[PDB]
Amino acid sequence: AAMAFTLADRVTEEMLADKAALVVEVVEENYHDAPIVGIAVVNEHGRFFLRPETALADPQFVAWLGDETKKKSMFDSKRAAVALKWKGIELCGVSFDLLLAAYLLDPAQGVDDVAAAAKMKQYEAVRPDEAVYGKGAKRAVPDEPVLAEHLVRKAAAIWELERPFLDELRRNEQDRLLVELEQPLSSILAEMEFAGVKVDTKRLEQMGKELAEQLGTVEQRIYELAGQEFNINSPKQLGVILFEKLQLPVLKKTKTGYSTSADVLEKLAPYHEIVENILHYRQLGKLQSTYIEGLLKVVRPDTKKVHTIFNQALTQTGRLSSTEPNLQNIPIRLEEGRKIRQAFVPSESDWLIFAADYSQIELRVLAHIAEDDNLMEAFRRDLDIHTKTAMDIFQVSEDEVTPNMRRQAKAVNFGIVYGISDYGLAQNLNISRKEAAEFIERYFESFPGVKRYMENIVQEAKQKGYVTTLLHRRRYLPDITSRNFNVRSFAERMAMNTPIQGSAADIIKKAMIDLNARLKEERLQAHLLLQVHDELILEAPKEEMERLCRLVPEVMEQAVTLRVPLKVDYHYGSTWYDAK
DNA sequence: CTGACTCGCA
DNA sequence: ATGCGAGTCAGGC
Numbered sequence: 047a048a049m050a051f052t053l054a055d056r057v058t059e060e061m062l063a064d065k066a067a068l069v070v071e072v073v074e075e076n077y078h079d080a081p082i083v084g085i086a087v088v089n090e091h092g093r094f095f096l097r098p099e100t101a102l103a104d105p106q107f108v109a110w111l112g113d114e115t116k117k118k119s120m121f122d123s124k125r126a127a128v129a130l131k132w133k134g135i136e137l138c139g140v141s142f143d144l145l146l147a148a149y150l151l152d153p154a155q156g157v158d159d160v161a162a163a164a165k166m167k168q169y170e171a172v173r174p175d176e177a178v179y180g181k182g183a184k185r186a187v188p189d190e191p192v193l194a195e196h197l198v199r200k201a202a203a204i205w206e207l208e209r210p211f212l213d214e215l216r217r218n219e220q221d222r223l224l225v226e227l228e229q230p231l232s233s234i235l236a237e238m239e240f241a242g243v244k245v246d247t248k249r250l251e252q253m254g255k256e257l258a259e260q261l262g263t264v265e266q267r268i269y270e271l272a273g274q275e276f277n278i279n280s281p282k283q284l285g286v287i288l289f290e291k292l293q294l295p296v297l298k299k300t301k302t303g304y305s306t307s308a309d310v311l312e313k314l315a316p317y318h319e320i321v322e323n324i325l326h327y328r329q330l331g332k333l334q335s336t337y338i339e340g341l342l343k344v345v346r347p348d349t350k351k352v353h354t355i356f357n358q359a360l361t362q363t364g365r366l367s368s369t370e371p372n373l374q375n376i377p378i379r380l381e382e383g384r385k386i387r388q389a390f391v392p393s394e395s396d397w398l399i400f401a402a403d404y405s406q407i408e409l410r411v412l413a414h415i416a417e418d419d420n421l422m423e424a425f426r427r428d429l430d431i432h433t434k435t436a437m438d439i440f441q442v443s444e445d446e447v448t449p450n451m452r453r454q455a456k457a458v459n460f461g462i463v464y465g466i467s468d469y470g471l472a473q474n475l476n477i478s479r480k481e482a483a484e485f486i487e488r489y490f491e492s493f494p495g496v497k498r499y500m501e502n503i504v505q506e507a508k509q510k511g512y513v514t515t516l517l518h519r520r521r522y523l524p525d526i527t528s529r530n531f532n533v534r535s536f537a538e539r540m541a542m543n544t545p546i547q548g549s550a551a552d553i554i555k556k557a558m559i560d561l562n563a564r565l566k567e568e569r570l571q572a573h574l575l576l577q578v579h580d581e582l583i584l585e586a587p588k589e590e591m592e593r594l595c596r597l598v599p600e601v602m603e604q605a606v607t608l609r610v611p612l613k614v615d616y617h618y619g620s621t622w623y624d625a626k
Numbered sequence: 627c628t629g630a631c632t633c634g635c636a
Numbered sequence: 637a638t639g640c641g642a643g644t645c646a647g648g649c
């Protein structure tokens with residue numbers, strides 16, 4: 047049966063109570079400079095729907111929106127906050143965000159709309175957004191009658207669900223995680239997204255020019271070596287040319303056919319000259335289509351800025367994700383790709399890019415959580431952890447560690463953090479499973495505390511049904527009891543990795559909140575631009591670099607206190623590339 | 627429109 | 637071995 051509400055033609059005082067469920071609807075997935083199609087408010091006085099032209103033009107309403115003492119409960123308040131920023135309107139006083147609450151209670155649910163969150167509490171008097179708006183090509187805002195009832199039902203749901211969600215969060219000891227970490231961070235991400243990052247489009251276009259020429263050369267060279275033309279981008283056509291036409295050996299298969307992944311090609315390289323060209327082609331083509339053309343597609347023509355959207359409620363570990371564009375995977379490892387960063391510049395004249403990154407935060411977190419004496423001492427001495435690991439597992443002095451030994455000790459450390467497995471390590475190191483197992487065994491002999499932790503955390507995941515992070519984020523692992531070896535092992539690796547990756551996420555998130563409070567107290571113009579898992583990227587006047595050099599690392603290093611120190615490196619320059 | 631396969635990042 | 641997003645090709649509606 048329909049839900050009662052007032053389809054208001056003008057704003058009234060009772061619509062401005064100091065407590066309400068608020069819905070500021072933005073249907074476009076990318077909410078930057080997007081339309082607000084309707085507004086719903088549910089409070090002690092009733093349910094109301096307001097047309098955006100009316101509400102957002104009303105001084106009383108706008109003032110109410112910006113009054114921190116007028117508390118609002120919402121779902122994805124960041125979306126509304128940013129769409130409002132583009133309209134020059136400030137949203138304050140959001141005390142409860144149902145999206146973030148749902149995400150903390152169970153990130154596996156994949157809650158993406160009010161209906162999904164409401165179902166967690168057997169509340170179903172609200173439709174999924176997709177049912178109301180449609181899929182993609184068929185997506186669209188419905189007529190006012192249907193739209194208004196949908197927004198009211200969502201507001202009503204939020205109004206009703208706040209208490210039960212807060213109660214369960216309290217029981218989980220996650221109440222502060224929502225109120226003191228995720229919600230305040232939400233506002234910071236909103237500012238970051240709205241500010242955006244300036245892009246030197248001319249530079250990108252220059253690079254695209256050079257790429258197009260080089261790509262054309264390697265392309266012809268490839269057909270020349272294949273004795274014909276084909277679509278190199280087709281793992282299907284390619285596999286036929288390599289494994290059938292040229293008779294190259296098949297060392298690995300995908301699931302649908304031949305495997306042409308870079309790791310396998312590298313092994314075929316010594317057989318035919320075409321392999322190196324295909325790898326080079328893969329490289330250039332990746333940069334051209336994803337980082338040159340792809341980036342250019344989302345730069346705002348007017349401001350020449352890209353405005354990413356940080357999905358704060360998606361990952362199973364507590365990390366953020368970045369989209370349109372993804373600014374968390376801009377090339378850096380290989381020089382050619384690294385040059386892409388020269389295109390990310392400060393938004394104002396005489397400003398510089400400042401980047402600060404935690405040094406080995408995951409292994410430092412592991413040292414803290416496992417309380418491994420050897421690992422803790424290593425970081426207390428600020429030793430090169432990979433060289434040290436090599437010394438221990440290979441039983442040699444620092445002078446006897448060869449480049450290859452460190453490389454393998456490094457790979458072992460990656461495995462330990464990801465959830466060790468002989469098969470996985472063997473694959474990565476291109477060695478036998480028995481050999482990989484021997485490495486792992488030697489590792490545990492040198493770091494018995496880590497061995498104890500891995501055994502204990504898996505036992506705990508089984509007993510409790512989930513694992514937690516330093517700040518009480520949690521992840522349920524039902525597969526941990528599966529009788530299927532593969533499924534169970536995947537869950538065991540997650541039990542081992544999540545607390546490490548997740549705790550690192552908690553720490554940097556708190557560093558971001560602490561940093562912003564510090565920047566405000568100091569009245570610095572510096573502001574965050576991006577976060578890339580273990581690093582923070584800022585931009586500021588050149589006159590503020592010396593202050594930032596001391597302030598940023600300190601705040602990041604002091605975000606939390608562990609049994610081992612946290613170490614932060616930093617650099618700054620004219621472009622993101624130069625902030626090295 | 628959607629699942630594969632690929633590769634960029636931490 | 638953790639796990640994110642985007643571009644490509646492919647088959648399919």
Ligand SMILES: OC[C@H]1O[C@@](CO)(O[C@H]2O[C@H](CO)[C@@H](O)[C@H](O)[C@H]2O)[C@@H](O)[C@@H]1O
Nearest residue numbers: 075076122125158159355357358359369
């Ligand atoms: O606004 C981001 C927020 O919205 C969700 C759905 O509630 O994701 C939507 O928006 C993202 C950014 O535009 C898209 O990537 C996603 O496809 C779309 O459903 C949440 O996942 C997210 O926290």
Ligand SMILES: [Mg+2]
Nearest residue numbers: 403404405406
């Ligand atoms: Mg680092």
